[PDB]
Amino acid sequence: SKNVVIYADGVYDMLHLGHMKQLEQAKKLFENTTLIVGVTSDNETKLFKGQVVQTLEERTETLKHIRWVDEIISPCPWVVTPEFLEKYKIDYVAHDDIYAWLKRAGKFKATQRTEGVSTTDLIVRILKNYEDY
Amino acid sequence: SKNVVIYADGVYDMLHLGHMKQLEQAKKLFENTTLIVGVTSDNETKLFKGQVVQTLEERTETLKHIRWVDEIISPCPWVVTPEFLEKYKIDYVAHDDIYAWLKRAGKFKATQRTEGVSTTDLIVRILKNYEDY
Question: Which of A25, A83, B19, B131 registers the highest number of CB atoms within 10 A of its CB?
């Protein structure tokens, strides 16, 4: 079948199984895909979304080890635009309003978040070996 | 060139960039490889080595997302034996004495550990936003 270009973006701070499962989902939306992953800048993430432990370089270097990732745009734009989709020949944006135009264009594909598998979740599990009393 | 079967093992608890860089190194020891990764059992890890946050299932499920990993043995034996190498047709063991026979057999390849990129290291970085005083 025709090769389909998928775009997913995010912070990917302290990359965990939840991120990887969502990237896998994006990658497998069609039989033959190219998965482009956008990694948000440190200053725009901190300004608009919240705290980030790892630098852009660190978050991008880690993502390059994930087998579902074909291409990385680092840093990606904070807001996705139609021109950005045209430039990279993106067929669908995979993500979990502001995204209204994406859906009007037929270029929206939903992916799911997995609960309970984040890196901070693991640290919470470590902490529970220490009873309050 | 001939395809070379590489075997690496470990706990792979809270998989981080240091693990992935070592798996990449193992995978790229020769131009054409099959990288088999062994994941140690919960009870043997806890008995012989130390504490483990994530279960065998969790550690194995995460490792399957790493592009360098071709095959996973889960659980792997705690001690690697010549018979184990014969069974899986392993040409080299990549790791960073007990391993004396591996080197006598020509089946030892050294890989390096990367400092300062572990998951706990990241948590330590979070904690430093909170001054002692």
Answer: B19
